[PDB]
């Protein structure tokens, strides 16, 4: 799994990318984030980079984490790695300390595809993972038509069936940095049950990565999205 390696070894360009992720959302400027796994441990570090080069691609890598400012939060830290993108998530187990469960996406990082350098035509099919609290088994499928500058997709096979939602058709747009981004609706039985946001990643738009917020009978559930090709 190379989890320990990711905590002790320095960056090595020979490792499979994504080689490095810059932790920002995962750890605010005034805080410290400690990650532990396979006997090793390392503290971060707003702006510090996580050696994702040592982790397996297309899988969730898992660490124990403690977030300090004094302990504020602890639980499991999840990292899903692709070649030009990667994201982190926090499964909360403990807050101020008392037991409390929450799930949240942290950083979504990588080589953003410029909205101004997108392929001019053709369709791309992305296949990958949707992972939520206690469930990294979801299958994500997403299609972008670059002529139409539109995307849509679907989540399948998550254990909680009302998370298996339609990611409705949406426009590709530039954000503030000219990154290509897609924001749309989540649909379940034709009703809007939340929203999703994807960034396009890679110089040839090889990947999408982002998240979804899905309204369920038992409350809002947050999902991490990542697919490729």
């Amino acid at each position, epitope marked *: 799994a190379g989890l320990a390696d990711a905590l002790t070894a320095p960056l090595d360009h020979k490792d499979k990318g994504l080689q490095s992720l810059t932790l920002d959302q995962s750890v605010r400027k005034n805080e410290k984030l400690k990650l532990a796994a396979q006997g090793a441990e390392k503290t971060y570090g707003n702006g510090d980079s996580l050696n994702t080069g040592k982790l397996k691609n297309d899988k969730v890598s898992r660490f124990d984490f403690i977030r300090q400012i004094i302990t504020l939060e602890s639980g499991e830290f999840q990292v899903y790695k692709q070649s030009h993108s990667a994201l982190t998530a926090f499964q909360t187990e403990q807050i101020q300390m008392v037991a409390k469960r929450q799930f949240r996406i942290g950083d979504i990082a990588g080589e953003h595809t410029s909205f101004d350098k997108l392929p001019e035509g053709g369709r791309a099919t992305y296949r990958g993972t949707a992972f939520g609290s206690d469930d990294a*088994g979801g*299958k994500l499928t997403y299609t972008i038509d670059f002529a139409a500058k539109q995307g849509n997709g*679907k*989540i*399948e*096979h998550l*254990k*909680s*069936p*009302e998370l*298996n*939602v*339609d990611l409705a058709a949406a426009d590709i747009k530039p954000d503030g940095k000219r990154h290509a981004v897609i924001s749309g609706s989540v*649909l*379940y*039985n*034709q*009703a809007e049950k939340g929203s999703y946001s994807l960034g396009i990643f890679g110089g040839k738009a090889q990947e999408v990565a982002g998240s979804a917020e899905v309204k369920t*009978v*038992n409350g809002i559930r947050h999902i991490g999205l990542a697919a490729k090709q």
Partner: antibody
């Protein structure tokens, strides 16, 4: 094709234990809930509960919660229903079935196994 | 915990008749509702899901309507092969998808 093939009809004495099986094939075993349904001859369908093969998350309805145990064998993609102590009133047909779903829509039950007739008597 | 009840429990109608079965839930379940058909000695077969979505392979004389706590299965022209008992099922809750008690449909000839 997707198939769910259950084991043969059973006769057991009251108080005995019994494990019936449900062989799933033609699809990815760990992507779908397995569902168990009881039906007394001439009566309605009864949702007993379900189990997810991916991590063996088992759910039981109040009426069956202690009397039956769901389990799964991933290497053989087989689901199992087991009684530890049978009663005459357990005499009935039992279905397994896949919980299916089109993304963006409420799920349904199907395909179904052919059903297993369990007869409890001495 | 969610209770589904069907009416009638038994009905009889002539071939070509319009048949209506109603399904009720003890609480609002939006449109997360299925209809199944079951014939003698066979497992049930889904007809409709999400209250009104016709499964492929199922004849269009079957249609479903309603929402919240009140739902309807309609057979527009009862055919001989439609002899069966019909079940609703709520798929609203956290799994635990309970069935209505069933409605037997027989043909008047």
């Amino acid at each position: 094709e997707v198939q769910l093939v259950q084991s043969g009809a059973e006769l057991k004495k009251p108080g005995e234990s019994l494990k019936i099986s449900c062989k799933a094939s033609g699809y990815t075993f760990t992507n779908y809930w397995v569902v168990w349904v009881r039906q007394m001859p001439g009566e309605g369908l009864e949702w007993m509960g379900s189990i997810h093969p991916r991590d063996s998350d088992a759910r039981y309805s109040l009426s069956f919660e202690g009397r039956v145990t769901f389990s799964v064998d991933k290497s053989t993609t087989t689901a199992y229903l087991q009684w530890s102590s049978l009663k005459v009133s357990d005499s009935a047909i039992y279905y397994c079935a896949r919980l299916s779903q089109v993304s963006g829509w409420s799920p349904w039950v199907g395909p179904w196994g052919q059903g297993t007739l369990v007869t409890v008597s001495s | 915990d969610i209770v589904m009840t069907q009416s009638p429990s038994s009905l009889s109608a002539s071939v070509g008749d319009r048949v209506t079965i109603t399904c009720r839930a003890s609480q609002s379940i939006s449109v997360s509702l299925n209809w199944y058909q079951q014939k003698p000695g066979k497992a049930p077969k889904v007809l409709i899901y999400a209250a009104s979505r016709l499964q492929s392979g199922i004849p269009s004389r079957f249609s479903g309507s309603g929402s919240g706590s009140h739902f309807t299965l309609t057979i527009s022209s009862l055919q001989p092969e439609d002899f069966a008992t019909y079940y609703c099922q709520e798929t609203y809750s956290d799994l635990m998808y309970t069935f209505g008690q069933g409605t037997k449909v027989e043909i008047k000839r």
